[PDB]
Design a protein around this ligand. Sequence first.
Ligand code: CA
Length: 291
Amino acid sequence: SVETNYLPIADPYVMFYNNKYYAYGTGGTTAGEGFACFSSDDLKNWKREGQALSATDSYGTWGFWAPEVYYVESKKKFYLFYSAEEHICVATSTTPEGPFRQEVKQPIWSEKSIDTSLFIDDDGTPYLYFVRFTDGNVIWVAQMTDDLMSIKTETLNQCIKAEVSWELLQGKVAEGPSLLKKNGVYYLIYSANHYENKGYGVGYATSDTPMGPWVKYSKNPLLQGDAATGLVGTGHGAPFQCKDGSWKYIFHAHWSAAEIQPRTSYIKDFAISDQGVVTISGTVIKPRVLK
Ligand SMILES: [Ca+2]
């Protein structure tokens, strides 16, 4: 039977671990503030796994946004990177579903920041992408310490700010970073505009280093509303590999053309060509939750 005909989260992230998809996003919780965990075998039908993170096990009581979860081979443990009260935080778990907890309930650093996304390079060096409120919402990067608990502030670098027309429909916002490396090029995939705008959209930038400098793709945006479904407010997503070796891009959209809330998530195809061009395309998978 059907719980809901949607995947009821915003700012979605998918981890493919041990032949199983695991989704985490903003909202859709059933046991208080924090993050839920959804799992799936096929990307269409999802089941709830429980409350991945409870507010009592973390810094903060409000604003649990934009979670990403990674199995770190180096540490043989799961790491949940997230925002809480407009600060960036990290919790750990021995399993994909949780409970993710902080031993000490504090953020990574003191400055307000959101939209954490981790990248560990071929070198073994960890990088954290996140938003600082320096000139609108701006995507920054810094190298992390070995324990993935702190950033090295001396490595702070500015990545992307809202500059071109499609990125300045509402407010001054570049956010929801995602990093992928392919054939020596680092691709920073991000969202621009206030999420409430129907023109929330996804674009990318490239660089020969993980911390820039960055050149934006000339044909951005990659995704700014899906034509076939009429989904609008499309953004804050994540790329991920599938069982068969192809890629997909999970993202949210407004509830409908009339109402923003509650945002829900959808899946399209994703790829980086041999000539280094990124595409988000294909018929939208409209996920649902079963019990
Ligand atoms: Ca994210």
